[PDB]
């Protein structure tokens, strides 16, 4: 009944850096050509949403953030062919156009239509579907899931299994897939290897799950919050280390523990110093280090290139290297077939209107993923 | 007739940084257990030897430098099994002990017995076989080929074909194998790809040869010395670019020429700034950049890790990634079957006694490889 009409609903608007989210009455325009309007069912709180608040990640304000979500298609614009009203969907913060050089490459996933590299905070057409008191509100990563309803470009949504539990599979929209893919697809962890994972939040726990799936023999978790260690061990870490416990740098500790360096390391925090530490702790001749965490805007790291000359490989990726529209439905099917677990990532469930409590939980160190429900 | 005896012979001794080599009489001890004494036939002048003179590359002085060479075994110490007197050999600046975790790894080649990481300038046993003016003189990379005779550990020498032309195949001891392998083994250049090669000296020309062998569609040579371009095109470059000809930074120029970034880039100079430029010019989602050049001692580069987070891979390697003792004889056999060419690398030939003129030819830009004959 709402098709082709403006919807008035609630959304969490970020008006200013370093402020709480403000629950506002917003107007959500109907979808234009090749757009899809989605009724939200569940959305996770990811550290990257917090990075918008903290100024770590720069995107145009005011904004409706949120990017890790699942919902049901309310309506489709002209020319949409990949979803229909009533379909369960996951919005894709990294699109898959299918036509750019990256989409056509076997390995590449950072589609050229992304809004990550040079954020505009709009739909593909350069406009917004959201107003608050007549003021346009920016989109975030072409998703904007902290709203009862959102509009996304067709290249930024995937149809998923009709029977999937949206309150769990929302994590496939970001954290789970990112960490898991970073292990299994980007690093290509090998059986019997030794892995070190820096950061034991939702993404890092998903890296651990991927290293375990890949058959790693040792998975060393590293975090300054020792409260994170029990869950890390539950999902496959063989050992955990707190850098604060040592009188020496942790790269030296990990090199000694691993008898000369790890096979694979992962930076899953977003600090420059830990990126260099994680590179250094992999074995100098054949080690691989993958950057997953997102650091503060515009800051360069300093490193000695001899770390690379000896033979190390250093790489990064977005969304675990997964081609998003192809991969999301397959990951949901794998979940439904019991190939991996999502419940270990979910520590809190709150109604949407308690969004700020959810962020307070993340910032305090107490949660992994809070799922917001509608 | 010299077996078991100290040999008095000529060598090029480097007493101090930023001074000419001194050709003078040295004493060369006989080989101890598991060591091999070699009569030099030919040695190339590699930019790395110049780096030792300049202080870019730190190694203990005084020293007998030289590491790209071929010769004939004069005598063997007790226990040597892999070469015999009269065998043609190439000394290996990267050893292959066969026993350490790196040697056992399928992809590693930076054997833990190397003298590169923390140079001592000795034999494996921590002593020197060279005396000059009554003083011990350091070895260089376990090779020291700027001498009529040298002594090397058995793990630092490979037996080659008895019919090998030593005045050509000395380049398999460093520059050819390094560049070729950086393309074919480390980057794994693919058929139909676009490559950019920064630096068109002997190593960069060898990278081009490897890219061409791998079936690259486009190979863009980059050098500030346009006199290098003609030879780069002869060996496979499809285009050459001089950064000094352009108002834009060369990474922008290359990204444009390649319709969004190259598949593979190679830094084959030894400058921090070109390492970051080369990384930048590869395609942000799936590009690979390999560091080959050696930059000034102890200096760090500065870079933005967003360059990696989008999907780039950055790596480096010593000796083209080749496991040295296994690979060198096979490369020589391939050269004898005319699978690649060395003559394009050899621009000048001089007697050993004219070593300082050879270094002048390199420093002035005029040469690729000068081969010194004994
Ligand atoms: N590359 C990509 O596609 C994606 C990247 N991200 C990024 O991944 C990172 C992790 O995200 P979440 O797991 O949601 O975050 P999180 O905040 O839940 O987890 C980070 C962990 O790092 C630990 N930590 C913080 N400082 C540390 C230090 N100095 N040393 C050791 N441990 C430290 C924390 O205690 C925490 O447990 C964030 O930077 C986020 O923006 C997240 C998803 C997608
Ligand atoms: N990784 C390894 O195992 C090995 C590394 N090396 C290193 O590889 C590098 C190259 O060695 P060679 O080919 O013998 O040296 P080379 O000096 O003959 O060639 C370097 C080229 O770079 C060009 N160049 C200088 N500054 C430039 C700039 N700003 N932009 C563009 N081009 C520039 C020069 O004009 C020259 O043609 C050296 O740093 C050497 O130490 C060499 C062999 C082994
Ligand atoms: C402004 C770009 C931010 C992208 C953040 C991260 C890669 N995505 C999801 O957490
Ligand atoms: C003291 C370490 C120098 C290594 C130099 C380079 C990798 N080898 C030959 O050119
Ligand atoms: Zn695309
Ligand atoms: Zn996220
Ligand atoms: Zn060399
Ligand atoms: Zn070894």
């Amino acid at each position: 009944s709402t098709a082709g009409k403006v919807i008035k609903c609630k959304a969490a608007v970020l008006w200013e850096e370093k402020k709480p989210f403000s629950i506002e009455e917003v107007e959500v325009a109907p979808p234009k050509a090749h757009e899809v309007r989605i009724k939200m069912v569940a959305t996770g709180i990811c550290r990257s949403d917090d990075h918008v608040v903290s100024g770590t990640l720069v995107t145009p304000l005011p904004v409706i953030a949120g990017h890790e979500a699942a919902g049901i298609v309310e309506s489709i614009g002209e020319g949409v062919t990949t979803v229909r009203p009533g379909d369960k969907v996951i919005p894709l913060f990294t699109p898959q156009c299918g036509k750019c050089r990256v989409c056509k490459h076997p390995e590449g996933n950072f589609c050229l239509k992304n809004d990550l590299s040079m954020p505009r905070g709009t739909m593909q057409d350069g406009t917004s579907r959201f107003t608050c008191r007549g003021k346009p509100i920016h989109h975030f990563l072409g998703t904007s899931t902290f709203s009862q309803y959102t509009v996304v470009d067709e290249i930024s949504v995937a149809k998923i299994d009709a029977a999937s539990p949206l309150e769990k599979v929302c994590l496939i929209g970001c954290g789970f897939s990112t960490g898991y893919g970073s292990a299994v697809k980007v690093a290509k962890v090998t059986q019997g290897s030794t892995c070190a994972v820096f950061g034991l939040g939702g993404v890092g726990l998903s890296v651990i799950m991927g290293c375990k799936a890949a058959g790693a023999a040792r998975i060393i978790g590293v975090d300054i919050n020792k409260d994170k260690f029990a869950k890390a061990k539950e999902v496959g870490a063989t050992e955990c280390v707190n850098p604060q416990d040592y009188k020496k740098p942790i790269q030296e500790v990990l090199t000694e523990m691993s008898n000369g360096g790890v096979d694979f390391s992962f930076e899953v925090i977003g600090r420059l110093d830990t990126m260099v530490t994680a590179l250094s702790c992999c074995q100098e001749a054949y080690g691989v280090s993958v950057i997953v965490g997102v650091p503060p805007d515009s800051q360069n790291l300093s490193m000695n290139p001899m770390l690379l000359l000896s033979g190390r490989t250093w790489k990064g990726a977005i969304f675990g290297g997964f081609k998003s529209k192809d991969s999301v439905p397959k990951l949901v099917a794998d979940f439904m077939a019991k190939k991996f677990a999502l419940d270990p990532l979910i520590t809190h469930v709150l109604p949407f209107e308690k969004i700020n409590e959810g962020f307070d939980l993340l910032r305090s160190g107490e949660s992994i993923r809070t799922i917001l429900t509608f």
Side-chain angles (χ1 to χ4, degrees), chain A:
Chain A
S1 74
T2 55
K5 303 171 177 169
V6 179
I7 284 166
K8 294 190 164 173
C9 69
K10 299 315 195 196
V13 180
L14 185 70
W15 294 99
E16 189 176 351
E17 65 165 11
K18 300 188 189 206
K19 303 307 176 183
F21 293 93
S22 184
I23 299 293
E24 305 281 351
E25 183 182 62
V26 301
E27 294 177 86
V28 183
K32 296 190 200 168
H34 303 289
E35 300 176 0
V36 176
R37 183 157 69 175
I38 305 167
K39 187 179 187 180
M40 220 64 3
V41 173
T43 187
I45 292 173
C46 172
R47 184 61 67 168
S48 298
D49 301 302
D50 186 63
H51 289 338
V52 178
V53 183
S54 71
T56 289
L57 208 42
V58 174
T59 194
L61 306 179
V63 68
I64 294 166
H67 62 283
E68 181 175 83
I72 298 167
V73 177
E74 172 268 345
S75 74
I76 61 172
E78 180 153 271
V80 171
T81 58
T82 56
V83 300
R84 297 200 212 81
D87 281 352
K88 293 183 169 169
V89 289
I90 288 172
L92 310 173
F93 78 82
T94 307
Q96 186 178 352
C97 82
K99 298 177 167 186
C100 74
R101 201 165 66 165
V102 175
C103 287
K104 293 178 174 167
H105 190 281
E107 314 291 292
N109 79 327
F110 190 51
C111 173
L112 295 177
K113 300 296 202 181
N114 81 79
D115 194 44
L116 279 69
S117 282
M118 293 230 60
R120 287 188 298 169
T122 61
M123 301 289 302
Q124 287 296 325
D125 76 357
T127 70
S128 173
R129 300 286 164 278
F130 297 119
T131 51
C132 179
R133 296 184 296 274
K135 280 158 150 192
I137 306 300
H138 290 96
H139 297 248
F140 182 55
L141 309 181
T143 61
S144 291
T145 66
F146 294 162
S147 180
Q148 288 176 324
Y149 292 85
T150 190
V151 182
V152 302
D153 290 289
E154 178 176 25
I155 62 171
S156 296
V157 67
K159 180 183 178 182
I160 66 169
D161 175 0
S164 48
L166 297 189
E167 75 286 0
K168 303 191 186 330
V169 300
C170 59
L171 299 183
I172 289 168
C174 182
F176 169 76
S177 300
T178 296
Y180 193 82
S182 295
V184 309
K185 189 174 187 296
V186 181
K188 304 180 201 298
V189 169
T190 50
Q191 196 168 30
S193 68
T194 295
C195 297
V197 183
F198 292 77
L200 304 173
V203 185
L205 293 172
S206 301
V207 175
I208 292 170
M209 290 185 179
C211 293
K212 180 175 186 181
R218 293 184 62 187
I219 304 170
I220 304 165
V222 183
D223 202 302
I224 57 171
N225 183 354
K226 67 181 182 164
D227 303 338
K228 300 293 171 177
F229 295 167
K231 181 63 62 64
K233 288 181 170 184
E234 291 166 32
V235 305
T238 55
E239 27 221 304
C240 291
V241 297
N242 182 348
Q244 294 174 353
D245 283 346
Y246 290 90
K247 300 190 198 198
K248 42 181 163 149
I250 204 69
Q251 68 197 34
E252 294 180 15
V253 173
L254 288 167
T255 299
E256 189 169 11
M257 285 174 72
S258 60
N259 299 303
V262 306
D263 300 289
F264 304 94
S265 71
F266 301 85
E267 198 285 2
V268 205
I269 304 159
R271 294 176 60 85
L272 298 179
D273 71 292
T274 46
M275 293 172 186
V276 177
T277 291
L279 178 64
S280 301
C281 81
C282 69
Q283 201 285 327
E284 67 177 354
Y286 58 72
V288 175
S289 186
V290 180
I291 305 177
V292 183
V294 169
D297 183 77
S298 297
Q299 305 301 306
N300 286 7
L301 62 74
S302 176
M303 64 79 73
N304 189 325
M306 284 301 322
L307 288 178
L308 299 176
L309 273 158
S310 54
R312 292 186 181 81
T313 303
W314 205 11
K315 70 202 303 180
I318 306 298
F319 195 57
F322 284 120
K323 290 178 181 292
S324 57
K325 189 158 182 157
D326 290 341
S327 299
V328 160
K330 295 189 207 105
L331 294 157
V332 173
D334 289 343
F335 175 65
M336 298 299 287
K338 303 173 192 292
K339 301 194 183 95
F340 53 84
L342 296 173
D343 284 353
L345 301 178
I346 298 166
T347 55
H348 298 81
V349 181
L350 292 170
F352 170 62
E353 300 91 335
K354 299 183 170 175
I355 184 162
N356 288 308
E357 179 179 354
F359 280 81
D360 294 339
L361 287 162
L362 180 66
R363 292 168 187 144
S364 73
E366 292 172 77
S367 59
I368 297 292
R369 286 298 200 259
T370 295
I371 306 308
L372 301 175
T373 56
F374 298 82

